[PDB]
């Protein structure tokens, strides 16, 4: 009966493809034919931050757009201050193999993670004047490759065990487990409403889960290699991906399809970080060839180039108000472009 089940699966895939083909009547470029170009945009470094001693692997802007958290391979977690370059905290880490970091929406906690396969939550808020590990969440098999805070009590993490999970900080045991990915999950982003989130894995696929029912409902393909970064559109009805094929694509949830392929002949290296600007007009991407690129969401043409790093760029982000862009590289420096 296994062969019959496989034939049924193939027929279902064919039916879904036929529905998507029927819904494809026009193209995003056709609706953007008459819109005026954004033109070249030039940004300059305003503040540069120093103090690290190893490669930088993560970054996450604060909810007040003034404090940002960064992590390096050395066991350090520095909280910066973009307005005036003054460090606030520097939390020693038990394991010096950090891969990701996150900053609380409330502003009272941070996170870590890496090859140790444990997610740690730190009491950033004043707790007797010292910072200590609030709770260590264990149970993942492989390395933890991303994490994002939903609230002050719920945390979503993705790991190399081909599995995402939703934890409970008060108790320490995961309440829901997301399964279905056939490869190592590499990226994870949340929707503004905090009810849905997307993820990507080493197998060319992106899924749209729900945090309540805990079941996949949609699957987007199109890439031909590993996917590294992902982020939502400001309206919450679209997201952009970044892979190792030197291409970035735009998907929409309602239409279940693919709109653009942001690429150029001159770029060959993969993408390590993707971020949207406010109103979604400008798309920021991080590349391996020491450069950061600015795209046009509507027409897919270059609007500027950012070059201040002598090593690979691995992380970047945009503030809540869209006032500045911060970039992290494999050296020990962070920069702010405005």
């Amino acid at each position: 009966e296994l062969d019959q089940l496989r034939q049924e699966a193939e027929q279902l895939k064919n039916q879904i493809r036929d529905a998507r083909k029927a819904c494809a009547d026009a193209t995003l470029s056709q609706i953007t034919n008459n819109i005026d170009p954004v033109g070249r945009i030039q940004m300059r470094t305003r503040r540069t931050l120093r103090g690290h001693l190893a490669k930088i692997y993560a970054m996450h802007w604060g909810t007040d757009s003034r404090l940002l958290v960064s992590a390096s391979q050395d066991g350090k977690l520095i909280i910066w201050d973009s307005y005036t370059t003054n460090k606030v905290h520097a939390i020693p880490l038990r394991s010096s193999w950090v891969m990701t970091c996150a900053y609380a929406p409330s502003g009272n906690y941070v996170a870590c993670g890496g090859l140790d396969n444990i997610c740690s939550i730190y009491n950033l808020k004043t707790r007797e004047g010292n910072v200590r590990v609030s709770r260590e969440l264990a149970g993942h098999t492989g390395y933890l490759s991303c994490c994002r805070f939903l609230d002050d009590n719920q945390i979503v993490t993705s790991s190399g065990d081909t599995t995402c999970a939703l934890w409970d900080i008060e108790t320490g045991q995961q309440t829901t487990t997301f399964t279905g990915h056939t490869g190592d999950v590499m990226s994870l982003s949340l929707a503004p409403d905090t009810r849905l989130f997307v993820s990507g894995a080493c197998d060319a696929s992106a899924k749209l889960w729900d945090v309540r029912e805990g079941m996949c409902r949609q699957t987007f393909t199109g890439h031909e290699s590993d996917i590294n970064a992902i982020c939502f559109f400001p309206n919450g009805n679209a997201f952009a991906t970044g892979s190792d094929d030197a291409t970035c694509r735009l998907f929409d949830l309602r239409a279940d399809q693919e709109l653009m392929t942001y690429s150029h002949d001159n770029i060959i290296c993969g993408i390590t970080s993707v971020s949207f600007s406010k109103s979604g007009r400008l798309l920021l991407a991080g590349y391996d060839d020491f450069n950061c690129n600015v795209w046009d969401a509507l027409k897919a043409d270059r609007a500027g180039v950012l070059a201040g790093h002598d090593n690979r760029v691995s992380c970047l982000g945009v503030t809540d108000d869209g006032m500045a862009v911060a970039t992290g590289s494999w050296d020990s420096f962070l920069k702010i472009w405005n």
Binding site: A19, C23, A24, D25, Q30, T32, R254, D256, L259, L298
Partner: peptide, 14 residues
């Protein structure tokens, strides 16, 4: 799944 046309999602995005 109920699917809208591409020209409507593109118009909404614009």
């Amino acid at each position: 799944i109920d699917r809208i046309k591409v020209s409507k999602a593109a118009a909404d995005l614009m």
